[PDB]
Design an enzyme around this catalytic site. Structure first.
Site, PDB file in Angstrom:
ATOM      1  CG  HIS C 119     -35.098   4.587   8.980  1.00 27.57           C
ATOM      2  ND1 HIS C 119     -35.246   3.280   9.291  1.00 27.57           N
ATOM      3  CD2 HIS C 119     -35.510   4.722   7.661  1.00 27.57           C
ATOM      4  CE1 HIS C 119     -35.731   2.605   8.214  1.00 27.57           C
ATOM      5  NE2 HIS C 119     -35.850   3.479   7.209  1.00 27.57           N
ATOM      6  CD  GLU C 120     -35.295   7.976   5.329  1.00 33.46           C
ATOM      7  OE1 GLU C 120     -34.634   7.597   4.284  1.00 33.46           O
ATOM      8  OE2 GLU C 120     -36.400   7.445   5.698  1.00 33.46           O
ATOM      9  CG  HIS C 123     -32.013   4.076   3.840  1.00 33.13           C
ATOM     10  ND1 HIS C 123     -31.881   2.723   3.980  1.00 33.13           N
ATOM     11  CD2 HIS C 123     -33.349   4.364   4.099  1.00 33.13           C
ATOM     12  CE1 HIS C 123     -33.085   2.178   4.298  1.00 33.13           C
ATOM     13  NE2 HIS C 123     -33.980   3.176   4.371  1.00 33.13           N
ATOM     14  CG  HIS C 129     -35.874  -1.055   4.874  1.00 36.53           C
ATOM     15  ND1 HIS C 129     -36.598  -0.800   3.767  1.00 36.53           N
ATOM     16  CD2 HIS C 129     -35.792   0.148   5.585  1.00 36.53           C
ATOM     17  CE1 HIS C 129     -36.980   0.502   3.779  1.00 36.53           C
ATOM     18  NE2 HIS C 129     -36.465   1.082   4.882  1.00 36.53           N
TER      19      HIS C 129
HETATM   20  O1  LIG Z   1     -41.454   6.163   4.896  1.00 33.76           O
HETATM   21  C1  LIG Z   1     -41.307   5.193   5.632  1.00 33.76           C
HETATM   22  N1  LIG Z   1     -41.933   3.962   5.556  1.00 33.76           N
HETATM   23  C2  LIG Z   1     -42.768   3.521   4.463  1.00 33.76           C
HETATM   24  C3  LIG Z   1     -42.217   3.618   3.012  1.00 33.76           C
HETATM   25  C4  LIG Z   1     -43.133   3.186   1.850  1.00 33.76           C
HETATM   26  C5  LIG Z   1     -44.425   3.949   1.958  1.00 33.76           C
HETATM   27  S1  LIG Z   1     -45.174   3.353   3.467  1.00 33.76           S
HETATM   28  O2  LIG Z   1     -44.914   1.914   3.462  1.00 33.76           O
HETATM   29  O3  LIG Z   1     -46.451   3.974   3.774  1.00 33.76           O
HETATM   30  C6  LIG Z   1     -44.163   4.042   4.738  1.00 33.76           C
HETATM   31  C7  LIG Z   1     -40.441   5.309   6.812  1.00 33.76           C
HETATM   32  C8  LIG Z   1     -40.817   4.665   7.972  1.00 33.76           C
HETATM   33  C9  LIG Z   1     -40.048   4.798   9.103  1.00 33.76           C
HETATM   34  C10 LIG Z   1     -38.895   5.551   9.028  1.00 33.76           C
HETATM   35  O4  LIG Z   1     -38.048   5.750  10.102  1.00 33.76           O
HETATM   36  C11 LIG Z   1     -37.987   4.927  11.222  1.00 33.76           C
HETATM   37  C12 LIG Z   1     -37.840   3.554  11.115  1.00 33.76           C
HETATM   38  C13 LIG Z   1     -37.754   2.790  12.256  1.00 33.76           C
HETATM   39  C14 LIG Z   1     -37.817   3.434  13.483  1.00 33.76           C
HETATM   40  C15 LIG Z   1     -37.725   2.717  14.725  1.00 33.76           C
HETATM   41  C16 LIG Z   1     -37.604   2.190  15.809  1.00 33.76           C
HETATM   42  C17 LIG Z   1     -37.385   1.658  17.156  1.00 33.76           C
HETATM   43  O5  LIG Z   1     -38.072   0.448  17.249  1.00 33.76           O
HETATM   44  C18 LIG Z   1     -37.939   2.614  18.229  1.00 33.76           C
HETATM   45  N2  LIG Z   1     -36.850   2.822  19.218  1.00 33.76           N
HETATM   46  C19 LIG Z   1     -36.467   1.518  19.846  1.00 33.76           C
HETATM   47  C20 LIG Z   1     -35.897   0.588  18.762  1.00 33.76           C
HETATM   48  C21 LIG Z   1     -35.926   1.281  17.402  1.00 33.76           C
HETATM   49  C22 LIG Z   1     -35.047   2.513  17.515  1.00 33.76           C
HETATM   50  C23 LIG Z   1     -35.637   3.454  18.577  1.00 33.76           C
HETATM   51  C24 LIG Z   1     -37.963   4.809  13.582  1.00 33.76           C
HETATM   52  C25 LIG Z   1     -38.046   5.575  12.439  1.00 33.76           C
HETATM   53  C26 LIG Z   1     -38.513   6.170   7.860  1.00 33.76           C
HETATM   54  C27 LIG Z   1     -39.303   6.061   6.730  1.00 33.76           C
HETATM   55 ZN   LIG Z   2     -35.917   3.138   5.139  1.00 34.02          ZN
END
Ligand SMILES: O=C(N[C@@H]1CCCS(=O)(=O)C1)c1ccc(Oc2ccc(C#C[C@]3(O)CN4CCC3CC4)cc2)cc1
Ligand SMILES: [Zn+2]
Ligand SMILES: O=C(N[C@@H]1CCCS(=O)(=O)C1)c1ccc(Oc2ccc(C#C[C@]3(O)CN4CCC3CC4)cc2)cc1
Ligand SMILES: O=C(N[C@H]1CCCS(=O)(=O)C1)c1ccc(Oc2ccc(C#C[C@]3(O)CN4CCC3CC4)cc2)cc1
Ligand SMILES: O=C(N[C@H]1CCCS(=O)(=O)C1)c1ccc(Oc2ccc(C#C[C@]3(O)CN4CCC3CC4)cc2)cc1
Ligand SMILES: [Ca+2]
Ligand SMILES: [Ca+2]
Ligand SMILES: [Ca+2]
Ligand SMILES: [Ca+2]
Ligand SMILES: [Ca+2]
Ligand SMILES: [Ca+2]
Ligand SMILES: [Ca+2]
Ligand SMILES: [Ca+2]
Ligand code: NA
Ligand code: NA
Ligand code: NA
Ligand code: NA
Ligand SMILES: [Zn+2]
Ligand SMILES: [Zn+2]
Ligand SMILES: [Zn+2]
Ligand SMILES: [Zn+2]
Ligand SMILES: [Zn+2]
Ligand SMILES: [Zn+2]
Ligand SMILES: [Zn+2]
Lengths: 166, 169, 166, 169
Positions: C119-120, C123, C129
């Site tokens: 995911h990162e 970016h 997103h």
């Molecule tokens: O930090 C994060 N989120 C927020 C940021 C602001 C603070 S908060 O809102 O608390 C958390 C953050 C969240 C998630 C992330 O990574 C992620 C993001 C999405 C996914 C996903 C997915 C899937 O549905 C599961 N499988 C089938 C389809 C697809 C791909 C594989 C995985 C890791 C990376 C960062």
């Molecule tokens: Zn992100």
């Protein structure tokens, strides 16, 4: 070898202070009066004198800030940590920061600035926390409503143990 | 009432540490053995106790970083500043940072992690640099690898002036 | 006048990465495999290639840190923010930081590092997103248990819209 | 999917600000009038709206500080750097910092706070420095006090290239 020696007291009785910036919550006049009165608490019972500078470097730099505000000891948004100060010494020594995520006041609605400052300046002058629950140097905020401050004996003995009586 | 103490020192003998992250250069196990030994240099010679925490807030937070890594002591790439540690105190106090643009080892090569950590942890405990060229607290790296590590007298006197000798036998 | 132009994509297809430090939670081998596999996600569907450097400066610097860790975008201790990365560009551009106040894992006990990294790195390569709830670039963490990752079509279209197909 | 936008800009037209703290040099009221006017320089000429918050998290956090005040842009005492602002973005993005080792005024003396703020807020919105010597975004302070402030054409073109003109009448 060398240790890190602390400066246990100011080696001069005449100290300067600078109010660097001002909280949104109180007038400049109110803020000014609170700090003057908070210094008075300590000057009243010791040979210490406090002079306000408007410009440049003073022994005790006073400022208000939020979160990370320049010393890597960030504040924490509303409540919790209210303010902090450094013990005697050069540079950051003596200085006092107040968390402007608190509501500061000249009375009862939020934190009484005079009382928190007076506590902080105890630190600026070499006092740690008291274990006596009646002491201004006790870690916990209390505001009695009382229009007239008298410094508790424990704090008088503490400060006098460093500077002697006035 | 309480006046601040005479020196920066810990006001408690039981201290905790956390290995926040790890260098590429050595196994977790080597890093852990290095740091455990480095603390034992000081516990052997005072009443200090050190316990490892796996997470959360410890007294001494240990980490590896490069360049700007969250304080007023940016690292500078290879050689130069090897590591730095804050004196005893809350938050950043006691924390130990290691420049991972260095080569860290458990041998004579690169920089021996045990030795630099032992040095850094003197800072974490209240020792500044010494002028005694035989002192562990001397600000210049020297490698020795004697099987039984003896802390130099200058460092024993410094640390015990802060915490006393602990059990002298 | 001048605005601040963003770098919308890397102008070269061959990119380097450096794993600067390592989480306590996983072996070096596990961490290494997770990152290699996370880059593979994007190289598999574009002309992009990724080379690991051990030393010095690479386009994508990977590190683990807690709280204030050197960019004034601190992490937040356990949960909440998991990691963040910078879009394409010099210096901090492309770089990825992971909050080592999370438990990272090669499976299900805590955050799956491969998936958060993947995911990162989206970016790092120019993707924001997604609003599609099935997308890897959707803001929310999901871990299916599935032993075989397939990159969702929305992400394939996103990355391809910048670099073309492999 | 979404690729990042072309330029650093706000992806919403409604923006908030907070005066976190105040300079000794002017009344609260003067500071507030200065900043309100500075924002209106930009709202007058785009679809941007600015609302003041009294506390909490705003898009644009405004504060006065000296020397090290929590970022990689320490102030430097009197003259020199007057103020700096971060481009649009989360956290520090959009925030505006003013050096309180300067003399801030609502006149021709010292540094006119309205003018320096108007300039800083162009940065908060997505404008870097201009080379047009008549531009508000020119990196050098010049005082004028015309009763009806006109934003120079170079700044109008820059800001509208980012957000369009809003209601052109
Ligand atoms: O930090 C994060 N989120 C927020 C940021 C602001 C603070 S908060 O809102 O608390 C958390 C953050 C969240 C998630 C992330 O990574 C992620 C993001 C999405 C996914 C996903 C997915 C899937 O549905 C599961 N499988 C089938 C389809 C697809 C791909 C594989 C995985 C890791 C990376 C960062
Ligand atoms: Zn992100
Ligand atoms: O920030 C503070 N405390 C904590 C620090 C760690 C984070 S936390 O634990 O949430 C808060 C903090 C708390 C209080 C404070 O200032 C203080 C401390 C004590 C007092 C007091 C008192 C009195 O009983 C009331 N009157 C009669 C006797 C005596 C004097 C007048 C007032 C302000 C200054 C700072
Ligand atoms: O960063 C460091 N110093 C400078 C680097 C240049 C930039 S700077 O000048 O700011 C600091 C630095 C940090 C940690 C260091 O750790 C050290 C310091 C001293 C020693 C030592 C030693 C001995 O002589 C060898 N043995 C026999 C007697 C003693 C003890 C065992 C080992 C590691 C050494 C140097
Ligand atoms: O900090 C500053 N600049 C440098 C200081 C030296 C250190 S540094 O070189 O990094 C940046 C700085 C910050 C803000 C400034 O605000 C500014 C910038 C430009 C102006 C202007 C102007 C005019 O010519 C006067 N009027 C007619 C035409 C225009 C608009 C109205 C006013 C304030 C100006 C300078
Ligand atoms: Ca001072
Ligand atoms: Ca607080
Ligand atoms: Ca170095
Ligand atoms: Ca600590
Ligand atoms: Ca980079
Ligand atoms: Ca987190
Ligand atoms: Ca200045
Ligand atoms: Ca902001
Ligand atoms: Na406030
Ligand atoms: Na290394
Ligand atoms: Na972790
Ligand atoms: Na000023
Ligand atoms: Zn502070
Ligand atoms: Zn206190
Ligand atoms: Zn450090
Ligand atoms: Zn040292
Ligand atoms: Zn980061
Ligand atoms: Zn700043
Ligand atoms: Zn500017």
């Amino acid at each position: 070898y060398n240790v890190f020696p602390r400066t246990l007291k100011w080696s001069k009785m005449n100290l300067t202070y600078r109010i660097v910036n001002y909280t949104p919550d109180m007038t400049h006049s109110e803020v000014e009066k609170a700090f003057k009165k908070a210094f008075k608490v300590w000057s009243d019972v010791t040979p210490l004198n406090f002079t306000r500078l408007h410009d440049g470097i003073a022994d005790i730099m006073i400022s208000f800030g939020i979160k990370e505000h320049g010393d890597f000891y960030p504040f924490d948004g509303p409540s919790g940590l209210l303010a902090h100060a450094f013990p005697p010494g050069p540079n950051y020594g003596g200085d006092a920061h107040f968390d402007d995520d608190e509501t500061w006041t000249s009375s009862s609605k939020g934190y009484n600035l005079f009382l928190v400052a007076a506590h902080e300046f105890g630190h600026s002058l070499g006092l740690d926390h008291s274990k006596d629950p009646g002491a201004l140097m006790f870690p916990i905020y209390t505001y009695t409503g009382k229009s007239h401050f008298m410094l508790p004996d424990d704090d008088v003995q503490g400060i006098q143990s460093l500077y002697g009586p006035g």
